[PDB]
């Protein structure tokens, strides 16, 4: 390092490019082995070296890759750089604006420009990792926060997770202050970007700070955050109030997480460290005002919607946040389950979950590639934690209010989406409610029993519902009460209606659904035998279509061997005559073979139960077999 003055022959504009890369590597190596003992703080004429790199990054006659190596600098030249960062500001800014287009997704992977872009990103991230520089941190952030999910952000998130888990406590505290600043500064920027800051970087960062380091940030922000939370929702005559709402958003999304990861004795105890909602000079004995945030949370928590608002979705998601917050505070501070209800599921005729979800999302179900499929919808995981915790916290009233919202609002006063949401809660919360079943099957069944459940066909939704039911049956066994019968009949009818599917084994799985559906709780379950006959009456030689009825009758048979023409809108003779007439079709195996199998099982039923139709059915079977006999031996 000491003789380095001669290096001006290198870096040279007239120097060939390869030497430019090489000498930088020399620097990188030397900066590794030095541990920054000298030529970083006081010793040595820094201005020459620093100005050299200022120009070097500032160059225009260099490839992007010379910059790419050149951004290995930042791991150094960013420690104890009292002032002079602003040269770094201007040069870094001009670089990033020079070579990082905002809208990335018009360049396909494998594009050389895309490769340069990702390489520069990675190099910047390594610089961030080795540097922990707050200015580098913030620069990275505004790189990220321009739109959502546009630069393979899994690597940025991994990096940001990495930065927090290391470094001196004050270092993280400063990083936190930095990442906080650009959320709150009054500069009018895109509100979407504002949300994205705390979302994609800050929320994670706080999630992964070191222990004991959180109270620093909570202490740092708490009073101003709460003050902003006080009020000011009033002004709406300007769309820019969107900025205001987003400001509240992030504040929520950070306070809540702060309630998490913090021990109960540090958010509430006889000694109240966080006593700063008030002046705290006199209120040092006991914590009761940190709660006051939930008192604030109420008002947005139950906000009577406008009539013709303009920020609908934003309002909605905002309320969603405030709810998540409420869940956090309830699960952190209060202990009694009556206070787990403390305000969390108390509801006014102007009510809460009627707010939290949209009503216009068609919101379809799937059987698609690669639980989280549309549990991605907001608020879910907090509710899940809530229910699991309270179950480990031993409530029927709390489920009682939900099932009020479910079946007492089984009326269409609540749109279907809301029902599906409640259900999906029940779905993923199955284990928690394994006991409290008997008084729930009929509502949940009533859900799928609707002629409207999502769209059409066996939704993954109805698969879930029926799975819940069946799984419940072995203990709850809810079979045979006046609503149970009519619902279940609707269910069997609907299921057996659509068992067919284009897909190879999805059909099989639906058939297995039917199988377990009947067999697990076969009582008072009329089997729609008319439906069956249409499902196998397909006088069509080269068709599939008779097979589905074949197999379906096969289920109704194999379960328990029940009677097979109780005034089913068809008469026995032609009923079975068509059934046997099936085995005429030799053109597909699953048609005739399965036909024979089902017929044989039918014979067994009729024999050991000694009915009278066995004679006629035997004669018919015999006749059609013979009509094969002399004709086509193989079949």
């Amino acid at each position: 390092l000491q003789h380095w003055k001669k290096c001006d022959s290198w870096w040279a504009k007239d120097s060939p490019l390869e030497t430019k890369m090489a000498v930088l590597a020399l620097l990188a190596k030397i900066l590794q082995i030095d541990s920054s003992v000298s030529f970083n703080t006081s010793h040595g004429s820094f201005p020459e070296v620093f100005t050299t790199y200022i120009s070097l990054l500032a160059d225009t006659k260099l490839d992007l890759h010379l910059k790419g190596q050149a951004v290995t600098l930042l791991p150094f030249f960013t420690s104890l750089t009292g002032g002079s960062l602003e040269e770094l500001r201007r040069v870094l800014e001009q670089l990033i604006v020079a070579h990082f287009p905002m809208q990335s997704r018009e360049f396909p992977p494998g594009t050389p420009r895309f490769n340069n872009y990702v390489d520069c990103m990675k190099k910047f991230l390594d610089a961030l990792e080795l540097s922990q520089s707050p200015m580098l941190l913030e620069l990275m952030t505004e790189v990220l926060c321009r739109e959502q999910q546009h630069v393979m952000e899994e690597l940025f998130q991994s990096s940001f997770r990495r930065i927090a888990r290391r470094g001196s406590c004050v270092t993280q505290v400063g990083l936190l202050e930095s990442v906080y600043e650009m959320f709150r500064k009054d500069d009018p920027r895109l509100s979407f970007t504002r949300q994205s800051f705390v979302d994609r970087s800050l929320l994670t960062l706080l999630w992964h700070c070191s222990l004991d380091a959180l109270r620093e940030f909570f202490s740092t922000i708490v009073v101003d955050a709460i003050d902003v939370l006080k009020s000011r929702f009033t002004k709406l005559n300007e769309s820019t109030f969107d900025t205001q709402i987003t400001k509240k958003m992030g504040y929520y999304k950070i306070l809540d997480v702060m309630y998490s990861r913090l021990p109960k004795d540090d958010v509430h105890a006889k000694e109240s460290k966080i006593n700063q909602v008030f002046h705290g000079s006199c209120i040092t004995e006991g914590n009761e005002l940190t709660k006051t945030l939930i008192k604030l949370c109420y008002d947005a928590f139950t906000e009577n919607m406008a009539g013709e608002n303009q920020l609908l979705e934003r309002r909605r998601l905002y309320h969603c946040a405030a709810y998540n917050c409420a869940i956090s505070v309830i699960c952190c501070v209060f202990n009694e389950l009556k206070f787990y209800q403390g305000f969390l599921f108390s509801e006014k005729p102007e009510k809460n979950l009627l707010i939290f979800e949209n009503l216009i999302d068609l919101k379809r179900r799937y059987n698609f590639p690669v639980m989280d499929e549309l549990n991605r919808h907001e608020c879910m995981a907090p509710l899940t934690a809530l229910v699991k915790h309270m179950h480990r916290s031993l409530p029927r009233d709390l489920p009682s209010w939900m099932k009020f919202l479910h079946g007492k609002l089984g009326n269409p006063i609540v749109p279907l989406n809301i029902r599906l949401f409640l259900a999906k809660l029940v779905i993923n919360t199955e284990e928690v409610f394994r006991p409290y079943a008997k008084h729930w099957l009929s509502p949940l069944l009533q859900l799928a029993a609707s002629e409207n459940n999502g769209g059409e066909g066996i939704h993954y939704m109805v698969v879930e519902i029926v799975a819940t039911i069946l799984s419940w049956t072995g203990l709850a066994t809810p079979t045979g009460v006046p609503k149970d019968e009519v619902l279940a009949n609707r269910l069997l009818n609907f299921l057996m209606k659509h068992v067919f599917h284009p897909k190879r084994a999805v059909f099989r799985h639906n058939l297995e659904i039917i199988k377990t559906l009947v067999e697990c709780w076969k009582d008072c379950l009329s089997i729609p035998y008319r439906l069956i006959f249409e499902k196998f009456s397909g006088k069509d030689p080269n068709s599939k279509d008779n097979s589905v009825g074949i197999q379906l009758l096969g289920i109704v048979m194999a379960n328990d061997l029940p009677p097979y023409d109780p005034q089913c809108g068809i008469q026995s003779s032609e009923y079975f005559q068509a059934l046997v007439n099936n085995m005429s079709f030799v053109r597909y195996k699953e048609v005739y073979a399965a036909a024979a199998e089902v017929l044989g099982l039918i014979l067994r039923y009729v024999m050991e139960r000694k009915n009278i139709l066995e004679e006629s059915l035997c004669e018919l079977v015999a006749k059609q077999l013979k009509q094969h006999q002399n004709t086509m031996e193989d079949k």
Partner: peptide, 7 residues
Amino acid sequence: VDDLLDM
């Protein structure tokens, strides 16, 4: 209603 939050 503040009683529930208070207690």
